[PDB]
Design a binder for this molecule. Structure first.
Ligand SMILES: CC1=[NH+][C@H]2[C@@H](O1)O[C@H](COS(=O)(=O)[O-])[C@@H](O)[C@@H]2O
Length: 507
C-alpha cells in the first residue's frame, strides 16, 4: 500500500484519505521548490494548484534536511526549516501516490492519511561515478542524478580523472583533454583481454559542467569533483610529461590497461605544484560546493625513489617514508587554498590510504573517504578528530556483480554483492557514541573498468543504489531487508516508465 523509500524515521497511518480534486489552494526559495513540485504534479496527474488545503510552514527547530508531513481528510501540512527539507517532504508526498507521479509522466487522485516525522541519519548520502575509465556524457549523468533524487541522495562524487582518461576541460592546460580525453582502445586491457585499437573517449566542456551542476542543484544534489592526484594520474602525465613525469625522458601515454599505474606525478617538481594549484582554481569556479576530492588512492612511491629531486625533498622533510612526499604535496595545496578569499576556500577529501603517512603535517580538518579496510580506517579517522565517509569496497562498490548468474554482464566480483548484502551492511555497528559525530555518512561507488554501456551502468546501479540511499537516510533500528524488498519492488514500474535498466533478481 504505502511504500516509501527511504523509510521515514517515524510513520503513523491515520484515518481516511485526502482527495485532491482537480484544483486546490496552497499557502507557502521555498516557493520555487513548490513551483517545481506543482509542475511535476500537473504533468503527471492534471491537478492544478493555486496560491488552503496544502500549507507549507517554516519550523526553525527542525534539522537542515528534516520535515513533518501531516496528511488528513482536511489538509496537507508540511513543516521544514530549510528549502531541502521542503523538497524532501514533497518527494515523500509524491511517493505516496501511484509510481507515475514520481516518474513525472501522465498515464491512462488521493493520498492516504499519514503523520510523518523524518530526518536523514547522515548528512552525506552519496554516489560516485568513475568516468575516467569509461565516459558516459551529459545525458547519462542527468539520468544518474534523477535516480539519486528519487531516494533523497544528496552528494554526487564525480571521479573525472584517471590513468586511462581526463574528462574535464581545463582552460590553462588544454592538452589534458586534447591528449587525456582520447585513447586507441574502448576496452581496457586485463589478463587475456587486449586493447581493441578503436579510437575512444570524450570530455566535458566547462559549459557542460555548469549545466550539470545547475541541474543537480534543483534536486538538492551537490557535486564534489575528484581530481585524483598524485596517483591515478597517467593521463595528466601523458598530457604534460615535461613537468609531471618523474622520468620525463621516457615515453608517457594514456594507459590502455586496468590496474595500478606507477606513472605518478612528480610531486617534487615546482611546475607540477603550479599545475595542481591552477587546476584547483578552475574547479573552484565551476563547482560551488565547499568540498574538493584530491584522491590519494593507490599511489606507488616507486618512481619517487628513482627520482633525484624526490629523494632530496624526502631528505629535507626528514623522513624515511616516501609516502610523506604525497602528504607534503597536499599540505602545500591546502596551505595555498587557505590564502584565498573565504568564498573560494574548499575542504579536502582523501581516500583512506593517506592515513598511511604522517598526516599530522596536514592537520585534522580533512575528510577521509574509507574504502579499503573501511571500518577500521573510519574509526582511525574519527579518533584523530577527522570527518569520515564510509564507502567500503564490500559491499558499497555497486559496479560489482550483483548475482552469480552466467547471464550477468562482465564486472568485478563473484556475485556476492547482492541487494541483500548491500542492505545488510550496518555503517555504525560497534561505533562508540563518542566517535559517531565524525561519521558524515555513506556512499556507493561505481568503477567503470568493465562498464562501457549506459544500459549496463543502470543495470548494475539499480536497485542497489536505493539500498545505500536507505542506509544513509533511515535510522538503523528502522531498517529491515524484507520490508525494503517489498517496498523496492514497487519501483520496478517507476524504472520502466523512466526507461532505466535494473537488476531483476529481487523483482
Ligand atoms: C578507491 C579505489 N581505488 C581503486 C579501488 O577503489 O577499487 C576500484 C575497483 O573496485 S572493484 O570494482 O571492487 O574491483 C578501482 O577502480 C579503483 O581504482
Amino acid at each position: 500500500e504505502i511504500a516509501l523509500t527511504p523509510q521515514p524515521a517515524h510513520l503513523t497511518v491515520k484515518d481516511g484519505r485526502f482527495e485532491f480534486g482537480n484544483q486546490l489552494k496552497a499557502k507557502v526559495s521555498i516557493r520555487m521548490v513548490f513551483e517545481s513540485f506543482k509542475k511535476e504534479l500537473q504533468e503527471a496527474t492534471g491537478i492544478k494548484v493555486s496560491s488552503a488545503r496544502i500549507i507549507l510552514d517554516l519550523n526553525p527547530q527542525l534539522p537542515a534536511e528534516a520535515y513533518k508531513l501531516n496528511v488528513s481528510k482536511k489538509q496537507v501540512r508540511i513543516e521544514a526549516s530549510r528549502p531541502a527539507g521542503f523538497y524532501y517532504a514533497l518527494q515523500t508526498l509524491k511517493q505516496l501516490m501511484p509510481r507515475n507521479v514520481m516518474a513525472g509522466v501522465a498515464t491512462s487522485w488521493s493520498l492516504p492519511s499519514v503523520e510523518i516525522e523524518d530526518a536523514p541519519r547522515f548528512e552525506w548520502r552519496g554516489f560516485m561515478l568513475d568516468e575516467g575509465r569509461h565516459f558516459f556524457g551529459k545525458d547519462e549523468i542527468k539520468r544518474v542524478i534523477d535516480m539519486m533524487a528519487i531516494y533523497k541522495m544528496n552528494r554526487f562524487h564525480w571521479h573525472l580523472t584517471e590513468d586511462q582518461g581526463w574528462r574535464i576541460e581545463i582552460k590553462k592546460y588544454p592538452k589534458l583533454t586534447e591528449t587525456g580525453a582520447w585513447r586507441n582502445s574502448k576496452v581496457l586491457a586485463y589478463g587475456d583481454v587486449k586493447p581493441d585499437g578503436e579510437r575512444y573517449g570524450g570530455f566535458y566542456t566547462q559549459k557542460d559542467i555548469k549545466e550539470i551542476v545547475a541541474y543537480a542543484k534543483k534536486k538538492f544534489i551537490e557535486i564534489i569533483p575528484e581530481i585524483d592526484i598524485p596517483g591515478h594520474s597517467q593521463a595528466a602525465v601523458a598530457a604534460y610529461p615535461e613537468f609531471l613525469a618523474c622520468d620525463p625522458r621516457d615515453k608517457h601515454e594514456v594507459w590502455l590497461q586496468q590496474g595500478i599505474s606507477t606513472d605518478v606525478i612528480n610531486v617534487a617538481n615546482p611546475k607540477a605544484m603550479q599545475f595542481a594549484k591552477e587546476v584547483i582554481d578552475e574547479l573552484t569556479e565551476l563547482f560551488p560546493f565547499n568540498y574538493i576530492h584530491l584522491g590519494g588512492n593507490e599511489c606507488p612511491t616507486r618512481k619517487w625513489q628513482k627520482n633525484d629531486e624526490c629523494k632530496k625533498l624526502l631528505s629535507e622533510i626528514g623522513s624515511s617514508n616516501f609516502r610523506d612526499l604525497q602528504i607534503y604535496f597536499y599540505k602545500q595545496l591546502k596551505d595555498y587554498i587557505a590564502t584565498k578569499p573565504a568564498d573560494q576556500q574548499r575542504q579536502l577529501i582523501f581516500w583512506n590510504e593517506v592515513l598511511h603517512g604522517n598526516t599530522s603535517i596536514l592537520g585534522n580538518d580533512i575528510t577521509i573517504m574509507a574504502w579499503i579496510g573501511a571500518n577500521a580506517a573510519a574509526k582511525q579517522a574519527a579518533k584523530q578528530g577527522m570527518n569520515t565517509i564510509l564507502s567500503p569496497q564490500i559491499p558499497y562498490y555497486i559496479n560489482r556483480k550483483q548475482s552469480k548468474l552466467p547471464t550477468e554482464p562482465m564486472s568485478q566480483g563473484h556475485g556476492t554483492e547482492t541487494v541483500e548484502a548491500v542492505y545488510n551492511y550496518q555503517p555504525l555497528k560497534d561505533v562508540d557514541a563518542a566517535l559517531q559525530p565524525y561519521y558524515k555518512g555513506v556512499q556507493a561507488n561505481f568503477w567503470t573498468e568493465w562498464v562501457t554501456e549506459p544500459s549496463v551502468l543502470e543495470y548494475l546501479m539499480l536497485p542497489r543504489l536505493a539500498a545505500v540511499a536507505e542506509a544513509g537516510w533511515t535510522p538503523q533500528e528502522k531498517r529491515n531487508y524484507e520490508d525494503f524488498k517489498e517496498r523496492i519492488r514497487k519501483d520496478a514500474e517507476l524504472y520502466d516508465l523512466k526507461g532505466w535498466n535494473y537488476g531483476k533478481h529481487i523483482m
